[PDB]
Design a binder for this molecule. Structure first.
Ligand SMILES: Cc1cc2c(cc1N1CC3=CN(Cc4ccccc4)C(=O)CC3=NC1=O)O[C@@H](c1ncccc1F)CC2
Length: 1707
């Protein structure tokens, strides 16, 4: 709050723009002599004599500069004067440079030396260059020069393998981007700018004197932005300015962070390569054709001074004026006795035969070409332009007239250059004005030829009055100033939208970086600042604050910004966002805001477009009036009663452009080009505004108008026109025929050529008809709540793709509109990529509905580009059954906050009293019911309400009742399980001294834990594979207490297992008539009742609380971003995250959740760098660094150290548990204020914050090549993490999401959450399971089974969700019967079960196998299919890799390249792999694990999850193979189990199992067996005594095994009878501990196969699996063959070790 004054901006601004001279006088060099011809004044400035060399300064041949840089300098034998003075600065230092040189001094090669300096760091030895490690930006003022430079740099740098490209009218694949100031500004406004600019190490500003021009502010804004980004990102980016020699250049050096003593170089006019004789003509008085004829006379007089060979280049201001000036000279040169006729003295045909042979060509070229004359212009002569260029370059063409576009576009200097008149038509000023300084400079800069001329000459013809300006300009006296005040509001708004200025103060500091600042300082009077004011305020705080204040008020008026004078804060609006993004001035935005409405007609639309302030200076001149009227008659859209006003003129010009009408009047043509260049940007703007306001009619109109301005055709015309290669009269013929385009789809090419009376085209048209983008639409709708529906939209492309026509992709808009098509209820952008063309695309979202339900909605999918490309699908509500309105939440009573003493135990109270005096309202409200009663209870409540100690109440009561009591607690997540295990081990096993156990993967030890445990922690799957056998396991049958936490996760992925085990627990509870107490905890449910009845809770025992009763009040803020491209959106979220921290939780803890591992580190670093660039560093660090060093010494991660030092940690799955616990501990202690964790870790974090920020809502799924939404469950959890009852009076959450999703989060966060069962899609594994254990003996048993499920309750509540067509009991029974019938059918077809008498069922072999190992039935079905007698190890790996277990193995972003790399690196080459295939991935990763290839952290975690189920899969393969009686594939499967456990291959050293052995040790051992293994032992090779403890611990575990065997009654056996081989296994070591497999993640147990088989016929006769311990008896019984003589083989194989395998043959 500082005193602010409103300025009048128009007063401070420079009106004349580039034409403005701060120049007072002008001092002419040497000969100034004036010659007065009485019709005009002639002022001559002579050439400067060539300067003698300075001290020791000498030219430096290319061989001298470093070796790797010589490429691109071929064709250059010698370095330029300038470039030798600059070579050290450019190549050998990183300093910011300002190079001022005469125009044409070849400042280019200097820039190239800077470029080569940057390129030179990336060499990489045997690699040529690193292309993707950097980017270089070249900003040129003109598009022509952009193309020029792209060419030159492309050629010169081609040897380095570098791409140079043009951005202004694959971006990611280009190293050098050449482009215009406004183009780059456009790019870096987008906010996802950094995706482009993150890699930029170098920026080169060409012709930076452009600062003086009206376009100058854009340069200012650019440099300001980039410099501020250098501070903010800490990444150093080199700036190279290249400028003309003009006053104030040092101020430019200051602007560019150039050291005046180091990188600042100024060369006066004496350094011009060709010394220049200058002639300045100006015209005395004002009369008309007399004036113009004077001008043409001048031109004549001046040409003739060159008669024989000299080349003259004439510059004229119009594409017409080339002809007219060559006309006026040919009229006055050849009219009086043919003056100077035959400029070419080759009238005997020297070069005449070359130019007479080239005459064949069009326009005025053919006329002038036989003489020395030619023309080059912007009137589009195409190829003829290039030939004119070539012919002038070879010095054939003598006199060439052209437009400035030549001076900028290609390099062709002449000996003498004449510029005629210096008057040009400016469309935006709407007037005729004095030509831009840059144009004059570049043009006169073409005078004299570097190798062909000792002296150049140039002549500038102009009007006399007030044009002393040009003498100032070309003689280095015209000062460079700042125009920033003109454009300040748009610039400021741009900076506000990017988030770089959040208020007035920030804005003032931003102004500090502008060229305007330096200029205002050093020339205060010019900018209207009193020396007194400047004295009292040297840093110009007052002026900057005032300017900012004024611009702010202007933006606030026009509603681009909400701005309050008090705080001085800025709030971005949508209009401002769009305004910055589409580059439209703010008055325009206000106008659109005023006139835009849903019912706006098309006429009105065109008029609105006409009032755009970009056009405010356009007027209708008299001489064009007539033509306008003609145009008006030919354009289709009525221009309403606006007569010819500027408005109407603009309107009609745009229409005329879409109609492709030809124009004559040249000012009218200019105006047209100007309105049509703008038209697309402005219209795309309007489209965005109305699209996001949801206005359907106007969205449709505007989008269409965009496509029409783009494709230059009306909707009325034929879509085929959009193909440019098609003959226009063919199309006009088609249009003349009256009939729909659609019909062409159903016609053969014959009928096509037939209907059009032009059969020749009949085929080609057909082709194009089927090249036209076309989509099919399928919809599946499921209701969610009475207000909300879920839509699955399937998009199927129907058409042929053509890279030429469709490019790499095609964009569409999905529009969900209401019944009247007046409102867009939901919209989103859909991008169909060419590589993934032909895959069907599933797009899921929710849409709102209102209980007076309409008949239907509509889904349109419209092309973003193509005219008349659309598909509309009605979505019918006629049969829709909305689910039942859900009941009110349980009212929260305000009880006296019941004290810890209310628990009656002192030992119990000691667990609590230290932490809190009293229980919270929820905990006291439930306290009686859960602690005092034994009945089942459901508690709903927002995460962080402390639902945990209600469960604990239940547990304390269970222990109160019976000391030996047993309780099972299930959590959906293993992470949560482990946290609960720590917490409750301490709370129960330590203090109360009970037993607390945690269930693991393996069955036996888990059974044990079930036996000893008072408190059992488990995930649903573990408890499932346990309690499936509950009939046979008593410990499952008796448990006093069953607690399920997070039961709403029933509605999520893996929810079905939860549902199954809970329902099984209720079934058991009712079957043993000793009730199993059931405590269910959940987030607030919209429907608690269904879950209650399901689990047996009374309405009174049911506490379901609204999310607003949450103990710590939640302040939720949701921030929409309209961006479709995820990466871009992510990048534009970066700064708003920081602002969120500094607004809502400046001093308090902050958690930030991000989508991926990489984004944790990245966002951490963003927060860091931004923080330190606020001149607040360690502001997030609340201790001293010193204190932290002892902990940080324990860290491996460099970046994590560095960020933690600044008070920001991060958490991802790559970090060690030690590191994670460290970062968590620091964050809890308050040492670091900010932690950034990945979304995966939201369940595995014990920690809490004052502020939780959710950065985006989506993650990438590589399998489907698309982004998918966060489960609402994960988001509920994340929001839960901002809860601090002790420290905070409020929790605070800021969710950042794509705009389309915004409303969603406002709903199901504030309101309670509806859940459904997905069990009906999981039925098979569970039904098979209950058939094996005979809980289901028949179809009726399955129907009965289904009545215990949550599914059963939900089906009548929300029928349409489960695809029930009614809620009647008939519909329920019918649907359930259909479901069990289908499920059982599938299970029979998969050979898992047998069906008998249509009612009864029985378990089969494959079914039993699947149920036993807990494997999906399709996996073992697939096994049964793909296994045979000849199957081997490689095939086995392929087969287990295809398991359904590995389907959910993730494919991450850009992992296809890394997997593609892996594919060629592995022993077994894979056949036609798709690298988004998870099974291909798990295959390669399995080969990687076998070969001991170490990989990135992601691939390692993946390998862990694979190896988890690898064992059970292989054992299943054993069972299946043995049941078919195959020997060779078996035992190979066993060997595969072994070599998977010990991570080794088939043929390999058996010694690799011993720790610390490498491929070097093995080499000296053979010169092999673990059995062959003190002095002689350790003296074999290199040894340390810790490896000795480990190896000795290995050999005392590693199996020592002897086997005895007898075939009972050898002789008493003959054909057909039973044969019993009794085997005896004994080991001479006492077993202590598990298997040792360092590379195998989990802790396994030895297991062994005793096998009997005939090795000849390849038959497996008998098999048995067991576990040894000390000694074991093994009975193998099998049936006997005939003729009493048979030879068998007895195998003994492990599942763990190689080499322990034994063989005994017998008979
Ligand atoms: C992409 C999208 C667009 C829109 C949405 C929601 C989405 N979703 C859906 C979605 C579903 N589920 C499953 C689920 C399970 C239990 C309870 C609720 C949902 C998630 O877990 C996460 C998820 N994320 C989304 O973003 O709402 C629309 C909308 N907004 C307000 C009112 C009505 C309405 F339809 C606005 C358009």
């Amino acid at each position: 709050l500082a005193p602010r004054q409103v300025l009048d901006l128009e007063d401070l601004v420079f009106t004349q723009g580039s034409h403005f001279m701060a120049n007072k006088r002008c001092q002419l060099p040497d000969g100034s002599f004036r010659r007065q011809r009485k019709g005009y004044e002639e002022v001559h400035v002579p050439a400067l004599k060539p300067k003698p060399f300075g001290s020791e300064e000498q030219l430096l041949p290319v061989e001298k500069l470093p070796k790797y840089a010589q490429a691109g300098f071929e064709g250059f034998k010698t370095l330029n004067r300038i470039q030798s003075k600059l070579y050290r600065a450019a190549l050998e230092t990183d300093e910011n440079l300002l190079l001022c040189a005469p125009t044409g001094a070849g400042k280019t090669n200097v820039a190239l030396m800077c470029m080569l300096r940057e390129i030179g760091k990336h060499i990489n030895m045997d690699g040529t260059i690193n292309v993707d490690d950097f980017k270089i930006i070249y900003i040129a003022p003109m598009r022509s020069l952009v193309q020029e430079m792209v060419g030159s740099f492309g050629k010169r740098l081609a040897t380095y393998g570098i791409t140079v490209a043009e951005l202004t009218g694959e971006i990611s694949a280009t190293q050098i981007i050449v482009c215009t100031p406004e183009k780059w500004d456009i790019i870096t406004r987008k906010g996802g700018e950094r995706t482009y600019t993150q890699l930029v190490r170098l920026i080169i500003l060409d012709e930076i004197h452009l600062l003086h021009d009206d376009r100058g502010p854009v340069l200012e804004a650019l440099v300001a932005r980039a410099i501020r980004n250098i501070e903010m990102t800490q990444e150093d980016v080199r700036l190279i300015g290249l400028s003309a020699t003009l006053p104030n250049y040092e101020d430019v050096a200051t602007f560019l962070r150039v050291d005046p003593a180091k990188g600042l170089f100024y060369f006066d006019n004496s350094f011009r390569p060709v010394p220049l004789e200058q002639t300045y003509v100006g015209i005395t008085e004002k009369k008309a054709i007399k004036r113009f004829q004077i001008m043409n006379e001048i031109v004549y007089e001046k040409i003739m001074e060159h008669a024989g060979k000299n080349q003259v280049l004439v510059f004229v201001h119009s594409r017409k004026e080339t002809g007219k000036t060559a006309r006026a000279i040919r009229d006055m040169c050849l009219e009086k006795d043919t003056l100077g006729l035959f400029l070419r003295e080759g009238s005997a045909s020297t070069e005449v035969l070359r130019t007479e042979a080239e005459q064949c060509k069009n326009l005025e070229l053919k006329d002038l070409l036989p003489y020395g004359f030619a023309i080059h212009h912007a009137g589009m002569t195409r190829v003829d332009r290039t030939l004119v260029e070539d012919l002038f370059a070879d010095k054939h063409i003598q006199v060439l007239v052209s437009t400035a576009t030549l001076a900028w576009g290609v390099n062709l200097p002449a000996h003498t250059v004449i510029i005629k008149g210096t008057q040009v038509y400016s469309p935006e000023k709407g007037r005729w004005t004095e030509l831009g300084a840059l144009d004059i400079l570049q043009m006169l800069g073409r005078a004299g030829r570097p190798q062909y001329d000792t002296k150049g000459e140039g002549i500038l013809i102009t009007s006399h009055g007030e044009l002393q300006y040009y003498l100032s300009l070309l003689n280095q006296q015209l000062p460079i100033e700042s125009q920033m005040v003109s454009k300040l509001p748009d610039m400021l708004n741009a900076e506000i939208v990017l988030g770089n200025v959040q208020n007035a103060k920030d804005a003032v500091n931003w102004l500090g970086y502008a060229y305007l600042y330096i200029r205002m300082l050093r020339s205060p009077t010019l900018y209207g600042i009193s020396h007194d004011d400047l004295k009292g305020d040297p840093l110009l705080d007052q002026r900057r604050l005032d300017l900012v204040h004024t611009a702010a008020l202007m933006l606030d008026k026009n509603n681009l910004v909400k701005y309050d004078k008090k705080t001085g804060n800025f709030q971005v609006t949508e209009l401002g966002r769009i305004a910055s993004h589409y580059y439209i001035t703010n008055d325009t935005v206000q106008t659109y805001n005023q006139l835009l409405k849903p019912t706006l007609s098309e006429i009105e639309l065109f008029r609105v477009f006409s009032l755009s302030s970009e056009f405010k200076n356009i007027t209708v001149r008299e001489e064009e009036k007539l033509e306008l009227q003609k145009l008006l008659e030919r354009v289709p859209i009525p221009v309403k009663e606006s007569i010819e006003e500027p408005s109407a003129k603009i309107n009609v010009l745009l229409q005329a452009f879409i109609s492709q009408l030809k124009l004559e009047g040249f000012a009218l043509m200019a105006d047209m080009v100007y309105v049509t260049q703008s038209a697309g940007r402005l219209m795309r703007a309007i489209f965005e505004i109305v699209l996001n306001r949801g206005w359907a009619q106007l969205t449709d109109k505007t989008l269409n108008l965009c496509k029409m301005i783009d494709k230059r055709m009306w909707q009325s015309m034929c879509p085929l026109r959009q193909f440019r290669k098609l003959p226009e009269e063919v199309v006009k013929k088609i249009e003349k025929k009256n009939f729909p385009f659609e019909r062409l789809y159903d016609l053969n090419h014959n009928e096509i050529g037939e209907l059009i009376r032009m059969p020749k085209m009949g085929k080609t048209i057909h082709k194009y008809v089927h090249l036209f983008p076309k989509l099919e639409l399928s919809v599946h709708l499921q209701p969610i709540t009475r207000s909300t529906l879920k839509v699955e939209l399937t998009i199927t492309p129907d058409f042929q793709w053509d890279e030429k026509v469709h490019g790499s992709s095609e964009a569409f808009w999905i529009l969900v509109e209401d019944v009247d098509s007046e409102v867009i209820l939901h919209h989103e952008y859909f991008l169909l990529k060419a590589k993934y063309a032909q895959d069907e695309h599933l797009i899921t979202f929710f849409v709102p509905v209102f209980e007076p339900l309409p008949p239907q909605y509509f889904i349109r999918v419209v092309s973003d580009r193509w005219l008349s490309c659309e598909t509309q699908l009605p979505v019918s509500f006629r049969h829709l059954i909305l689910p039942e309105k859900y009941p009110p939440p349980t009212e929260l009573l305000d009880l006296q906050p019941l004290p810890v003493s209310a628990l009656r135990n002192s030992a119990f109270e000691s667990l609590y009293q230290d932490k809190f005096p009293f229980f919270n309202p929820i905990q006291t409200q439930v306290f009686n019911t859960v602690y005092n009663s034994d009945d089942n209870v459901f508690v709903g409540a927002p995460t962080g309400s402390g639902k945990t100690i209600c469960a604990e109440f239940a547990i304390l009561r269970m222990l109160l009742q019976s000391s030996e009591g047993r309780c099972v607690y299930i959590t959906p997540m293993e992470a949560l399980a482990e946290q609960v295990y720590m917490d409750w081990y301490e709370k129960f096993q330590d203090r109360l001294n009970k037993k607390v156990v945690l269930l693991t993967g393996e069955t036996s030890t888990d059974l044990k834990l079930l036996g000893k445990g008072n408190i059992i922690i488990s995930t649903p799957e573990k408890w499932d594979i346990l309690s499936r056998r509950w009939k046979q396991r008593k410990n499952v049958q008796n448990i006093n207490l069953f607690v399920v936490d997070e039961v709403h996760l029933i509605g999520g992925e893996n929810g079905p297992v939860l549902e199954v085990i809970c329902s099984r627990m209720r079934y058991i509870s009712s079957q043993i008539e000793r009730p199993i107490r059931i405590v269910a905890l959940s987030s607030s449910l919209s429907n608690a009742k269904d879950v209650a009845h399901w689990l047996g809770c009374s309405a009174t025992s049911t506490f379901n609380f609204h999310p607003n009763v949450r103990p710590v009040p939640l302040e939720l803020h949701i921030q929409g971003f309209n961006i479709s491209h995820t990466q871009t959106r992510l990048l534009s979220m970066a700064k708003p995250v920081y602002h969120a921290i500094t607004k809502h939780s400046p001093k308090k803890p902050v958690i930030v959740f991000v989508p991926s591992r990489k984004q944790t580190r990245l966002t951490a670093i963003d927060i860091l760098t931004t923080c330190a660039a606020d001149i607040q560093r360690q502001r997030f660090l609340h201790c001293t660094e010193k204190d932290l060093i002892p902990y940080l010494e324990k860290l491996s991660d460099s970046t994590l150290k560095e960020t933690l030092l600044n008070g920001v940690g991060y958490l991802h799955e790559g970090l060690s548990p030690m590191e994670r616990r460290l970062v968590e501990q620091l964050f809890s202690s308050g040492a670091i204020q900010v932690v950034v964790a990945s979304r995966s870790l939201c369940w595995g974090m014990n920690v809490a914050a004052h502020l939780v920020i959710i950065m985006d809502t989506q993650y990438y799924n590589g399998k489907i090549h698309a982004y998918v939404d966060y489960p609402i469950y994960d988001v509920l959890q994340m929001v839960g993490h901002a809860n601090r009852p002790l420290q905070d009076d409020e929790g605070r959450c800021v969710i950042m999401c794509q705009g389309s999703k915004k409303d969603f989060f406002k709903k199901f966060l504030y309101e309670p959450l509806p859940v459904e069962s997905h069990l009906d899609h999981c039925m098979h594994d569970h039904f098979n399971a209950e058939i094996v254990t005979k809980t289901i003996e028949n179809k009726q048993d399955a129907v009965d089974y289904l009545t215990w499920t949550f599914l059963y309750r939900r089906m009548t509540q929300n029928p349409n969700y489960y695809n029930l067509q009614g809620i009647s009991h008939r519909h329920l029974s019918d649907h359930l019967s259909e479901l069990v019938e289908q499920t059982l059918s599938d299970l029979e077809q998969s050979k898992c079960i047998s069906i008998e008498d249509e009612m009864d069922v029985a378990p089969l072999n494959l079914g039993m196998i699947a149920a036993y190992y807990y494997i999906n039935y399709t996996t073992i079905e697939l096994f049964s299919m793909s296994l045979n007698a000849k199957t081997k190890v490689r095939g086995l790996i392929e087969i287990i890799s295809n398991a359904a277990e590995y389907e959910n193995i993730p494919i991450r972003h850009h992992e296809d390249n890394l997997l593609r790399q892996l594919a060629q690196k592995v022993p077994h080459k894979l056949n036609n792999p798709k690298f988004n295939d998870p099974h291909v991935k798990t295959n390669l990763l399995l080969q990687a694990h076998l070969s001991r290839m170490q990989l990135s952290a992601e691939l390692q975690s993946d390998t862990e999850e694979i190896l988890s189920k690898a064992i059970r899969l292989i054992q299943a393969c054993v069972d299946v193979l043995s049941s078919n009686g195959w020997l060779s594939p078996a035992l190979a499967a066993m060997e595969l189990a072994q070599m998977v456990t010990q991570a080794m291959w088939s043929k390999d050293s058996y010694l690799k199992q011993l720790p610390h052995f490498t491929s070097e040790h093995i080499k000296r051992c053979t010169d092999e067996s673990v059995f062959d293994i003190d002095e002689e032992r350790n003296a074999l090779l290199q040894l340390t005594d810790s490896q000795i403890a480990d190896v000795a611990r290995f050999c005392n575990r590693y199996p020592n095994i002897e086997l005895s065997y007898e075939v009972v009654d050898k002789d008493s056996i003959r054909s057909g009878g039973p044969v019993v081989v009794l085997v005896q296994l004994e080991r001479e070591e006492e077993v202590t501990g598990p298997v040792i497999a360092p590379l195998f993640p989990q802790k396994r147990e030895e297991g062994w196969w005793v096998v009997i088989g005939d090795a000849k016929s390849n038959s497996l006769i008998s098999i048995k699996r067991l576990t040894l311990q000390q000694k074991a008896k093994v009975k193998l019984d099998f049936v006997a063959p005939a003729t009493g003589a048979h030879n068998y083989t007895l195998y003994f194989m492990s599942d763990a070790y190689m080499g322990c395998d034994q063989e005994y043959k017998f008979s």
